[PDB]
Design a protein around this nucleic acid. Structure first.
Lengths: 227, 68, 112
RNA sequence: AGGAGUGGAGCCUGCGGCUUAAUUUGACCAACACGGGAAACCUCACCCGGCCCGGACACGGACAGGAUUGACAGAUUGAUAGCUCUUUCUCGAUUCUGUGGGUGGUGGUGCAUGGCCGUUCUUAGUUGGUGGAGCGAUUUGUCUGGUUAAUUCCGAUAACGAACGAGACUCUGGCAUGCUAACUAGUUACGCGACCCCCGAGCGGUCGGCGUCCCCCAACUUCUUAGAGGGACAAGUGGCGUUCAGCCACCCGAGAUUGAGCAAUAACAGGUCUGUGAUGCCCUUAGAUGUCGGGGCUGCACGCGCGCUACACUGACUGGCUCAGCGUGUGCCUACCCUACGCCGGCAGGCGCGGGUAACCCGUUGAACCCCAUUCGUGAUGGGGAUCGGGGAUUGCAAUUAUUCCCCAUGAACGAGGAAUUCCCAGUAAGUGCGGGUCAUAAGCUUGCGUUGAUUAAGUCCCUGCCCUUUGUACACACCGCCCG
RNA sequence: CGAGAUGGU
């Protein structure tokens, strides 16, 4: 770069890069249980951290797939030789991640399991994992040539105002069967977690809580006490 | 117009008075400071509304019983 | 596109009597006819151009779709028995009826 | 109650009908300046012609005196397409050929589907668990009354305890001489320094006036930027309220309704396959429904929709003076950006030479209406500027069916608009100009910003509709229903 | 107490 690009173009181009990388990884690592990518920079080096539920499938027999993925990421995005490193990392609390639950429901349906038996199978596992509530939806040609939908729901679920940006986790997916495409949508509502990264640290806007009064003595008589 | 107070305000004010009656009085600006240290309230604008109805209830309790 | 009736009932699929309306001629067992009178009950009186008048009936596929009228031009299917009676197969627009007569397919009797 | 209108005129632009080789097509409150749809080519799907394989792979055949590839010249052709015909060089196992099978498609079905969006519907609405009532569909909770913008609160009570919507929440506007602290932001002051004026107590001065004239190794944060905190609660006083929940006026105060975003359950045969490597089934597949050349999308007796300019004197024309805010900027394949200053030309425009990847350069963004002086004189007039002749620049591979721009000339209808009908309550309506999108060339559209700034209301259910309750029914395809001679 | 019929998708 013989003269540097302006800050408006620089900040937009850095966002366009993260979007294409997330699409490539989404469709390479679908059955391997992918759920997100994180990227960080240091002098002469870029480190990419990738989250999945079955990390040994991301590596392969002696690390083959990490070496193949390092090669194609460098080849496509134009990094110089050896400046790119890929690290696989294991997903914590996989029942509270909406993308891993949308993909496992997609592969469970694609194997020929019945729709209600599959949907109550994930609805139980999300609520046993410690969510405050959830909503699962399937739609398309469910049983016959005319389209239908099903809602499955449990616990609490908010729809309006700013808290939706940090208390609700969501995913949408497609599955192709011999008669055409079905849609899947998954929503999960997270628990409040003061510190520990199960959920958000910020409380709900209308949850006031009062501290309890303690240990007073009702009677008194006048006395003095020297040190 | 409309100045009616919702159940989130009216319930929090009653629970404060049941526990801390001996701290409270008729000055809004002192009640506003007490309610900030005895409770966790997410918004400054909600804290002002709670201390307002607490100040209204203290002036009623000085005359006779309040059923709640 | 343009409606030409007026009602609540947008509940159907649109008629699209357009584009590849490929021109249809007779096979064996068929005739061209002009409507002379319309009766009740989904039936009509029609004259074909070789001069045998018949009582004629709307096929179940054309009900409440292809509205027939007096002096209109139609394609009719004959029966191998009961020669006084027949069934309607198609209606020709005044744009198609002139093309039939331009191909010499109709005697100089039909009105357009 | 009123304001500005629209419907009448000329022109722009979307739709139907007609015309045509083709004038590609979706859509009929909730279609018609809408598909971000401003088509010269491309886009491109339509119409007239011509090259090409970009037909994987499998099996069989043909084949190293050879499977196959490419081409000069003449004829041919819109054509410098070796397309094809005559001729005779060239390449080297990569192809060719028959059968099977694939592959592509702005082809068909939105009435086969996913995703997204619109609408019912801007209002206050919706639902389990355990208990009570009915053989049952169902019901109560979810209410007689008062109160609120609100299924918002009070209270009542065969129900008790909860969930979503509402509200809270997020962004934004108006206040801080208090805090943090600035050569990519300023002020004040002086060591002072410089130009101009004497108008000034008084000189041509220490001292006065004027400055986007210039240094500070002066002091500072009022004006600009932007981080943290503060502030408003129906909190205070007087009335009215089953004296509760609330409602009205007033003091003090920057301020006692700022404006947007997000939004439930259940639906619709609503729109979209022409946004997609989202997609089932059907069609087509070498004389192709997968690339180049030319034409069309603009065609004009006629009906309709959203708009621009006007009918003048509360004006038009010619000079002079003086004030904004929101933004964008060297294109990463893809090859283009925003402009000061000097010179040539009436103008559009041309040449030279610098700054800017931006609180740094265009830039103190010298904006329009408005403001001051002049000319015209109630005349289709010096109002209005449609229609049409001749000449000159700029973009581009190409401007004719006129791309856009400049100049002289020509000088239509129109004198405040029939029956009808739209939007609007305060920095609002209306007037007035400037940025962004689309862009090689270019707004009469749309999405934002500032500037000048009113009249009329503080209400009602009459007209068109929405919410809740009681009531009647021969309706459930649900009054655009059903039905008799 | 004016006049207020009818119904392809």
């Amino acid at each position: 770069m013989a003269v540097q690009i302006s800050k408006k173009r620089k900040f937009v181009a850095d966002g366009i890069f993260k979007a294409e990388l997330n699409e490539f990884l989404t469709r390479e690592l679908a059955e391997d249980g992918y759920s997100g990518v994180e990227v960080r920079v240091t002098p002469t080096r870029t480190e990419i951290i990738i989250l999945a539920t079955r990390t040994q499938n991301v590596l392969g027999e002696k690390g083959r797939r990490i070496r193949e993925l390092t090669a194609v990421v460098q080849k496509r995005f134009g990094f110089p030789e050896g400046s790119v490193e890929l690290y696989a990392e294991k997903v914590a609390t996989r029942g509270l991640c909406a993308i891993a639950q949308a993909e496992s429901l997609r592969y469970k349906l694609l194997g020929g399991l019945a729709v209600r038996r599959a949907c109550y199978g994930v609805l139980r596992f999300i609520m046993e994992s410690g969510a405050k509530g959830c909503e699962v939806v399937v739609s398309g040609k469910l049983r016959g040539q005319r389209a239908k939908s099903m809602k499955f729901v449990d616990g609490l679920m908010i729809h309006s105002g700013d808290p939706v940006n940090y208390y609700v986790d969501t995913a949408v997916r497609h599955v192709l069967l011999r008669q055409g495409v079905l849609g899947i949508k998954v929503k999960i509502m997270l628990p409040w977690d003061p510190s520990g990264k199960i959920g958000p640290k910020k409380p709900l806007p209308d949850h006031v809580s009062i501290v309890e009064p303690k240990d007073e003595i009702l009677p008194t008589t006048p006395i003095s006490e020297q040190k | 117009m409309g100045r009616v107070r919702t159940k989130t305000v009216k319930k929090a004010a009653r629970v404060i008075i049941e526990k801390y009656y001996t701290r409270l009085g008729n000055d809004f600006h002192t009640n506003k400071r007490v309610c900030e240290e005895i409770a966790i309230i997410p918004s400054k604008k909600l804290r002002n509304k709670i201390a307002g109805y607490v100040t209204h209830l203290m002036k009623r309790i000085q005359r006779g019983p309040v059923r709640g | 596109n343009k409606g030409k009736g007026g009602k609540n009932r947008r509940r159907g699929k649109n008629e699209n009597e357009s584009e590849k309306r490929e021109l249809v001629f007779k096979e064996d067992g068929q005739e061209y006819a002009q409507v002379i009178k319309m009766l009740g009950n989904g039936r009509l009186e029609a004259m074909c151009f070789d001069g045998v008048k018949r009582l004629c009936h709307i096929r179940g596929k054309l009900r409440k779709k292809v509205w027939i009228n007096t002096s209109d031009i139609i394609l009719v299917g004959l029966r191998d028995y009961q020669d006084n009676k027949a069934d309607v197969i198609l209606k020709y627009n005044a744009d198609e009826a002139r093309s039939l007569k331009a191909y010499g397919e109709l005697p100089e009797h039909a009105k357009i």
